[PDB]
Ligand binder design. Structure first.
Ligand code: HEM
Ligand code: HEM
Ligand code: HEM
Ligand code: HEM
Lengths: 141, 146, 141, 146
């Protein structure tokens, strides 16, 4: 469960992401597809080549859903209900993959936000992404 | 796939008593009932909405038989699982787009199904040997993913 | 979340277990130690030989806690609170291990309950053990 | 270790620029802070109630240096990780009783620390090669568990 300090660390770090959210989202995806090739099984309709517009557009969407989660940190299950339904009933991505995207988003943030990525903030972001994953797989069965 | 001779004997011995057709249908059906998200690959199979719909579905039964037939064939080649399953690995990755985590789920369901059918005979040591075998098959089916 | 039908299925199956709980708990543990040897790192102080009295004794404790969760199925997080604290603050068992014990308990039930272990019951039991594992792991950080 | 020449080369060139003392201390420290339950092995290091206490603890820093030093030596044996880490695998199992899942967690923290230090240079291809190395090391460290 997220503590007050966690919420404060997450809002501040994401705040610094600002207008780069979309770019970072796309970067996290690319890192995931390269590091963990089994994740590509969920995107056979995508051109997965470096710089593809599908990855870019999808990176934006992911990033914006996270922004919404940060903005609604105290009420995530409700703010993400529709995405939660989408992943459970249509996309049906195996739960293990959420940890892989989470790790790649953390690596992206670490690479882009050196001063902000302190040990306590790293901890908070890891817990936040874990919570988001829990919410997104909560209706699977 | 480090199997000791005594483990290999235990695996083969039990397998000789398995009706692959029936066990194949049960394992695949149970996978689809217990881990409902794995149904994403079988929308062409028709009604999968309730347990009886899944378990008695003739297409599930037929696919189960095909899956387990390939698995048995694998038990005859324990020292070369990777070669044995190379073309199937490629197919599952490039054509069917199946996340390999599915092979691990099926492996564990198969272990419960063997336990259900054999009762006592499926002792702790026998299960341990089967756990290595299902992990080995899962790893071989994943080896050609890229 | 457990559905009404899941709860019914779990009470029925567990009621057939009855006064064998302890024995099945010990078997689940032995199964786990043999199939997943890395789990033994948490029990260096135990005698782990077949028929071990420490293993028998610990089996009973695990089985009793599961019985208690079944008896309080609509209030599990509170019924298991103490155990959640213990696992989080003292034992600190890595969360992956819970999935391994859960699998071995399912194998154990399958091996002893041929008539009750239908596909529907298997599914409900898997969900039940996953919720128990979630509770036991909920205070980790 | 199915490592590609361009991949082996990527790992090596980056590593030549790493301050093992700093990175080791930072990796072990972050592990204890991010995954609190890993502190179970380090009760005797002193105070670890806060991130500042963990990160500044001299025994944490020194242990991190020793761990990463052994990791470093392993990078010169990428063709034989199992053989290089065999003794260490036995010790981690037989004497220290460390669940190998811990090795995977440290791997991933390590990767985050490298990205944090190298920024730009830690591109997606370079991360991919390092993920393969970290999993390789974890697997070799777990190989002798029984
Ligand atoms: C933090 C975790 C994640 C979040 C917040 C997230 C969010 C989203 C969003 C916003 C969409 C677009 C829905 C729309 O178009 O309105 C989406 C779709 C999708 N996501 Fe998730 N996702 C996450 C993790 C994952 C992972 C781990 C996978 C599998 C590796 C995945 C696979 C997909 C797929 C295949 C689509 C449909 C893409 C398309 O066809 O355009 N997602 N997700
Ligand atoms: C023991 C592991 C498995 C083995 C040995 C196996 C083997 C096979 C074989 C022999 C075929 C037919 C190949 C062909 O049509 O040319 C097949 C097809 C297929 N497999 Fe696998 N399979 C396994 C597990 C799984 C899992 C767990 C899933 C998904 C959850 C899956 C998904 C599929 C699908 C969707 C097809 C094509 C079905 C169709 O004809 O429409 N397989 N598999
Ligand atoms: C179904 C999930 C589990 C339940 C219900 C459970 C329940 C319990 C209970 C009742 C105790 C005794 C506490 C007391 O004396 O008051 C205990 C202790 C313990 N548990 Fe858990 N446990 C579970 C899973 C695990 C797993 C996965 C591990 C690691 C493999 C583990 C490791 C331990 C250890 C090492 C002890 C202390 C044993 C001793 O020193 O006497 N448990 N647990
Ligand atoms: C990259 C993976 C790792 C490597 C290469 C590594 C290497 C080492 C080395 C070289 C030693 C010194 C042993 C000696 O003096 O004979 C050691 C000790 C130790 N390691 Fe690991 N280690 C790794 C990960 C871990 C992790 C993740 C943990 C637990 C979180 C851990 C727990 C310990 C403990 C408890 C000791 C004994 C410390 C003492 O002397 O009090 N190690 N390790």
């Amino acid at each position: 469960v997220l503590s007050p300090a966690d919420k404060t660390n997450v809002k501040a770090a994401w705040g610094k992401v600002g207008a780069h959210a979309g770019e970072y989202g796309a970067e996290a995806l690319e890192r995931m597809f390269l590091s963990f090739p089994t994740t590509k099984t969920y995107f056979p309709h995508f051109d997965l080549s470096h710089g593809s517009a599908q990855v870019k557009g999808h990176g934006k969407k992911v990033a914006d859903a996270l922004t919404n989660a940060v903005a609604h940190v105290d009420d995530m299950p409700n703010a993400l209900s529709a995405l939660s339904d989408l992943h459970a009933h249509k996309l049906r991505v195996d739960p293990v993959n959420f940890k892989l995207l989470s790790h790649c988003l953390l690596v992206t943030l670490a690479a882009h936000l050196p001063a902000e990525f302190t040990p306590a903030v790293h901890a908070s972001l890891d817990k936040f992404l874990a919570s988001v994953s829990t919410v997104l797989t909560s209706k699977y069965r | 796939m480090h199997l000791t001779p005594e483990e290999k004997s235990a695996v083969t011995a039990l397998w000789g008593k398995v009706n692959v057709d029936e066990v194949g249908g049960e394992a695949l059906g149970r996978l689809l009932v217990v881990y409902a998200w794995t149904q994403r690959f079988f929308e062409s199979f028709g009604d999968l909405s309730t347990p009886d719909a899944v378990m008695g579905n003739p297409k599930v039964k037929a696919h189960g038989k095909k899956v387990l037939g390939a698995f048995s064939d694998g038990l005859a080649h324990l020292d070369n699982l990777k070669g044995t399953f190379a073309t199937l690995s490629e197919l599952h990755c490039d054509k069917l787009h199946v996340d390999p985590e599915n092979f691990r789920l099926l492996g564990n369901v198969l272990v419960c199904v063997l336990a259900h059918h054999f009762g006592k005979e499926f002792t702790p040591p026998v299960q341990a040997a089967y756990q290595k075998v299902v992990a080995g098959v899962a790893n071989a089916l994943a080896h050609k993913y890229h």
